[PDB]
């Protein structure tokens, strides 16, 4: 159904990445000089500190200047709603492209179609395009991570001669908040070699990831950063988190960290360029 209150589809998990890229390129969008994916937790409430309020504004401005794609979850609750609102206002002020990926079952309401969606999860209508993953019904655990990771890897494998970047299209992952999903996505991205940028000085887990750049130090940092998250998590989950963090820190030559001292302007572009 084409949401209206751009476009919205329902693609099953077992979908061909090449088919999706052909769909998006043949008659929807052009080749992407750059592509940036942001990962955030499912928490509806996020800290809208001035630092995060300005860094992402600079990021979206850079994306418009380069005509880059932005990949987010696509839910009205959280930082992604802020990103969508900024996209809307910039468009009101050569168009930006934003894609949200989420599971159809995880959506609070489902309408079959040009259907209309009017305000269980709620999805933002600001994002131009959205994706629906059909893996189950009322499935609390994430079911779209695999599809997003495969799509990012395939787009990395793509070749574009027009781009100044040597050969393949550049891709950069952005980390802002904490949560198991954040670590899983970062580990998959780093394992895929796509550089990741973490905003130090803000965010629950970004701070510890910046601090690290064997088990005792990581455990101390994790407990210091998240007094409540660790308490609820069982011991096995904590061990799995430590394993993931060690995995990503092993390949530290890729990830880059924004520093608090360099609080001046033109820092987002500098960090992205350095990582690339």
């Amino acid at each position: 159904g084409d949401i209206q209150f751009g476009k919205y589809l329902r693609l099953s998990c077992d979908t061909d990445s090449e088919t999706l890229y052909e769909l998006l390129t043949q008659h929807w969008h052009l080749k992407t000089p750059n592509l940036v994916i942001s990962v955030t937790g499912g928490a509806k409430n996020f800290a809208l500190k001035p630092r995060m309020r300005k860094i992402f504004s600079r990021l979206i401005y850079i994306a418009q200047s380069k005509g880059a794609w932005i990949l987010t979850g696509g839910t009205h609750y959280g930082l992604m709603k802020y990103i969508g609102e900024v996209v809307r206002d910039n468009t009101i002020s050569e168009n930006i492209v934003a894609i949200g990926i989420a599971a159809w079952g995880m959506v609070s309401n489902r309408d079959t179609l040009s259907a209309q969606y009017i305000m269980l999860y709620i999805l933002d209508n600001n994002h131009t395009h959205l994706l629906l993953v059909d893996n189950g019904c009322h499935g609390h655990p994430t079911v779209e991570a695999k599809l997003r990771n495969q799509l990012e890897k395939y787009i990395s494998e793509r070749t574009s001669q027009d781009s100044n970047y040597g050969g393949k299209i550049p891709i950069v992952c952005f980390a802002q908040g904490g949560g198991r999903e954040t670590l899983k996505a970062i580990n998959t991205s780093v394992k895929s070699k796509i550089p990741c940028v973490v905003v130090e000085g803000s965010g629950q887990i970004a701070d510890v990831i910046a601090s690290l750049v064997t088990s005792s130090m990581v455990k101390e940092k994790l407990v210091r950063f998240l007094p409540r998250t660790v308490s609820r998590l069982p011991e096995e989950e904590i061990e799995s988190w430590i394993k993931w963090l060690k995995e990503i820190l092993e390949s530290s030559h890729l990830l880059t960290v924004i520093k608090m001292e360099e609080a001046g302007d033109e820092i987002v572009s500098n960090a992205i360029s350095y990582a690339l």
Binding site: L9, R10, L11, S12, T15, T19, L20, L23, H27
Partner: peptide
């Protein structure tokens, strides 16, 4: 057109 392409995709 678009509907047929979408159906063929999935």
């Amino acid at each position: 057109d678009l509907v047929n392409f979408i159906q063929a995709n999935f």
